[PDB]
């Protein structure tokens, strides 16, 4: 109820949505090492 | 001095004119956008 | 060491002060990266949640207790990151048992180095010249903007002071590997403490405007074995 | 110079050493050009004006004294 | 008919004219910076035959032009003379003659600086004019004198404008308005004007002293003759750092106004941070000397300077978190002001992070004059000034013209400048750690790929400027179409799930000032009645 | 982006050749000279940039 | 330069002529012009203070070489002292006698005001003549070898503000000759009341030192 | 400063006594839902009768779907379900059978 | 029909700040530890040649 539904997202923000944050910075690895490999 | 409604006259240019329908003055603005560095280079060196 | 294309790491440390300051800066930038990640996650979660926010709250103003909590958090954080900075600066600004001195008073658009600490044959000073190598003089065996007429030899495993000054315009004695850089006022005089630990070749430049020939004023130093260094100071 | 020639800096530990050579040279000149016999009292701080102080200023002062015209704001006595 | 554009007694014409002058200077600076980066695209002489003298001439032209004719005039003058006396309820601002004199002494500066840049000798010492680097022996001719005269006249213009703003705030306040609860923009302009009034005269005195040295051939700061140029170096620092505050704080006020009028919620700790900004303005005279750590000051002096420079750095994070709370719990719209403010705040967080990395004095020994310092201030100045001006324009164009601007063009413009800035500024970390040596016309070819990507980003910025001018043309030619259809944004803020269509139509804006619902700028006689507020 | 890359390509083509030295073999010789002695940091990685 | 100066003076006298002639004067215009003129004189005061501090800063002698201990003994150049002391002392006397003569004028506006204006004209003429006597061959030619020319340069640059003070007094007198500046929306009086009070303080600051110090 | 919240409620009822159009209903609903407080069934019924004083069924849809989606409140459903059921059965506003099957 | 309300302001910011700190710390620390162990092994090797120079 008040406690059971409180942890739906309170403790769920560490394993459910971290993929979004990880992919929000994934551009660096695909972009800059790719350019390094292309030029060198 | 107090006859400006303030809809299209606020700009310090005249919209009217067949020779310059905001086409000659703005092309001059285009020219002067890159004119000063080009002439600065041209005075001492080549472009 | 030597600048390299598409590098990913700082050059090898040449003095213990360099390694200490780089490690402390690494810890500082670790803290900076974690707080930047904090702020980035703040922004990301807030925008993602409120791109479809149903209700806009309006009556939360100060929260004085938690307000002063995040007001006193940065102060203690900066004090914590400054205590190692405090001890590092207190150790670095002092000179502990210096051994010898090398001086560099470069003229306009080129460098000049002085080795008055060592005697060439008997009493007389050691002094030489060093000028840039342009494209026309860039033959097979020289580097553009990285090779000078004469290299600068350094005594390995020896505490060395850098009594640096200028003549006409401020010239910047820059050796990134040694972690040394001081702008030399022509009328003033500045000295710093350092000592090279390993044997190697390092390149530098002038990171301070000189004039028309400011660019072609490189610094080319090197390190060799102690008998070889002593012999070089003997012959020159 | 095995990491120790003069020990800890005591003459002027600060990085800036602008007004450093003149004081290190005036006492030496006074002790030298007074009788020309004994220099023992002023025979301990040689490295102060030999390595810590640039030798260019020292040789410039020596040349100026030799030629009879000095550039520094000093006193004849 | 020409007295309106030559003897404008009204503030709005002067504001738009300053905007035009600043945008012209900015586009010229951007084009010539593109030329410079093309010269630095690859080592050697591909387009310019070496000429390091000419190289530093255009480098100093770059710096001086964008600092003195792009960021300064419009960003303060337009917003000040359009809001500060208008929102308070004053009928008309005083001192039209002073503003006209400032305008008409400006072309002296423009022409003199053009002649100074277009002589064979020229002045090319960069933004630093400390002798004997700025000596007449290398940079001969009249360039130094013309630059000094331009400095003097620009300082006079800015100081007189600040005086007019200050007297308007102090005297033209309406009866129904408390001083403690002034809006953040008013306090921002107040602090900026007072810091300018306490900073510009010192630099003006130093510049006059240098002019006397160059004319009468005296010995004050030359190394020969027992001079101390470090005095003028400290004067320039105590100008620039408060001048950095002058350039940034009005941007902070503009962002605060945007977020307050958009997010529909109050700014967290509004009065507390008004007091904090007052403290910043009072204490800015103590953190001006964190750049001279290597000149030869004492260790205790280094400790004092570093202690000050990281003890006055908390309010930056305080403002970051306050605006984060201001956008927290409310409604955020996919509008250009939102994204402009978000990008500006994020890149400012990275810039402040780099500055905090620079705050330490021990690390400065190996970090000063490296690439990291120039990368840091390019970060902070570039994003701050450029994004603040862009957000101000895209947030205020319907406020001063009433003709809607395309949403699609604005979004693609933002994306272009944003991607250009990111691709330019990301590799600077590697560039700093390697130690790219600054101000070299022919740098070592090791950084060739990074120079290539920097040139690509610069050219992206230039085509973005072309998009800017084309967007201006599109607005001028199709404002009526934008008003007719939905191709452009019609209302600043979207309604919430509480409002009926008619109610929102008759309650389109609930802001803190009448400017939003004030009709397109009326004649020179506006605000005929005082503003009453309770 | 396409306009950027195309205009850069055409302006580079119109610029013409402006480097009579520093070919690939020049860089190879310089890297071999630098990375043959004097306490090399694992032989370096100074690859030639491009054509 | 002379025709530019005449054009500027003509523009100033013209604009004060339209100010006195068009009328339409309220408290707004008078207060605004008075505040603006006070700001201008405050800027002039700040310029004076900056110029004074330009040569005042040599107190602790923080230099490095060729001096670093004022005075840098070793050079016997021309001493700038004792040349302008007559001018500064007669200016001190004039400032002392006009510290409240302007207020006496504004209170009375009678024949005593005419006498005050006449004596002011005579004293400023004496000042400009005693400045003009040493015009070219004052100390030497300013071409090379500078050791003590800083005081002379300071006096030369300070004389200019007195020059425009005399010019504004003359243009005010001619404006009264044109019958425009009466006891209404006064612009000359509203500034000349505080001109002496804002001038004497800074001149005493510049005279207590820079003449009794640095010799 | 954790100020009182019933003062704004009493302001809502005193404006209800001065209510003259649906505009005041919109204003009071926006002000009440803006606050962090969860409205009790009493004040919810007061808002509902204020909206029905002009007899505007779309306003009833607004208030009901706002109650369904006012505040996450750690994802409170069952209380919301029973509250919506009773505030529906008091008068009868069947609308969830239309927009949901879309 | 719950009467005691207005108790959600305190914990929202607390959970947000702790989650942000944890996520930023982990994200930074990954590459920080990787590049740090790279540097530490390189420095240990360099110390090995430094010792062997005098040995
Ligand atoms: C005001 C701060 C500022 C800003 C914004 C910039 C912006 C930029 N700077 Fe500069 N720079 C300095 C301050 C600044 N710089 C300083 C102090 C120096 C050192 C000076 C020296 O030592 O001489 C320097 C030096 C410097 C150098 C060193 C010169 C060298 O030796 O070769 C380089 C190198 O390329 C460079 C590049 C750039 C680039 C690519 C940008 C790009 O960010 C440019 C992008 C800018 C735009 C986006 C402008 C858009 C134009 C508009 C039309 C505006 C429209 C707005 C409205 C009116 C609505 N800068
Ligand atoms: C927009 C303007 C701006 C801003 C905001 C800053 C911000 C800062 N700057 Fe910088 N700076 C410049 C403009 C700016 N700077 C310019 C033009 C120069 C070049 C001048 C010259 O050297 O030539 C320069 C150079 C410069 C130097 C010169 C380096 C050297 O000596 O050569 C130093 C050195 O200390 C420095 C320090 C700082 C610091 C500590 C901050 C801090 O205030 C940053 C504040 C932000 C943070 C606080 C981070 C985000 C918030 C937090 C994570 C909160 C928690 C963290 C802490 C409280 C520890 N700056
Ligand atoms: C494996 C590689 C796959 C992709 C190959 C692309 C071509 C390439 O590698 O570059 C060829 C050259 C590079 O030329 P550059 O070194 O960048 O510039 C030199 C310009 N000059 C001096 C000749 C006037 O290109 C040129 O000289 C011509 C300019 C670029 C090509 C023109 C546009 C595309 C045409 C199709
Ligand atoms: C390559 C292939 C990529 C395919 C993507 C589309 C898949 C189907 C559509 C879909 O799944 O979209 C998933 C939903 C669909 O939102 P919506 O379409 O209902 O519109 C409703 C919302 N306007 O969120 C979105 O898109 C949100 C798009 C708007 C917000 C833009 C900024 C959000 C981040 C964008 C990405 C940033 C970089 C990555 C960071 C992790
Ligand atoms: C943005 C990153 C740019 C990196 C440039 C430097 C690295 C070189 C590189 O990455 O080259 C990768 C190539 C660059 O082709 P290019 O002609 O521009 O090379 C110019 C310099 N020699 O990509 C592509 O061909 C992508 C396709 C572009 C259109 C080709 C049309 C062919 C018909
Ligand atoms: Cu240099
Ligand atoms: Cu240099
Ligand atoms: Cu600072």
Residue numbers in the entry:
A (entry chain V): 22 to 61
B (entry chain M): 28 to 74
C (entry chain P): 16 to 251
D (entry chain U): 7 to 83
E (entry chain K): 1 to 534
F (entry chain W): 103 to 153
G (entry chain O): 55 to 269
H (entry chain Q): 45 to 146
Provide the publication's sentences verbatim.
The S. cerevisiae respiratory SC is composed of complexes III2 (CIII, dimer of cytochrome bc1) and IV (CIV, Cyt c oxidase) with CIII flanked on each side by CIV in the core tetrameric SC (IV1III2IV1). CL is distinguished from other phospholipids by its unique dimeric structure containing two phosphates, four fatty acids and a free hydroxyl at the 2-position of the glycerol linking the two phosphatidyl groups. This unique dimeric structure makes CL ideal for supporting the organization of individual protein subunits into multi-subunit complexes, as well as individual complexes into supercomplex (SC) molecular machines, such as the mitochondrial respirasome. A presumed advantage in SC formation is bringing active sites of CIII and CIV in close proximity to each other to facilitate Cyt c shuttling of electrons. Here we show that anionic phospholipids interact with positive amino acids and appear to nucleate a phospholipid domain at the interface between the individual complexes, which dampen charge repulsion and further stabilize interaction, respectively, between individual complexes.
To address whether PG substitutes for CL in SC formation, we performed single-particle cryo-EM analysis of the trimeric SC purified from CRD1∆ cells. There was no density in the region of the CRD1∆ density map corresponding to the position of the Qcr10 subunit of CIII in the WT SC density map; we assume that this subunit was lost during purification. Densities for UQ6 were found only at Qi sites. The Qo sites were empty, which may be due to use of chromatography for purification resulting in the oxidation of UQ6. Analysis of the cryo-EM density for Rip1 subunit of CIII showed that both the hinge region and the head domain displayed weaker or less ordered density when compared to the WT. PGT501J/j appears to replace the internal CLs in each monomer of CIII surprisingly resulting in little noticeable structural changes for CIII. PGT601K appears to only interact with CIV unlike CDL601K which interacts with both CIII and CIV. However, there were significant differences as to which amino acids interact with PG and none of the PGs formed interactions that bridge CIII and CIV.
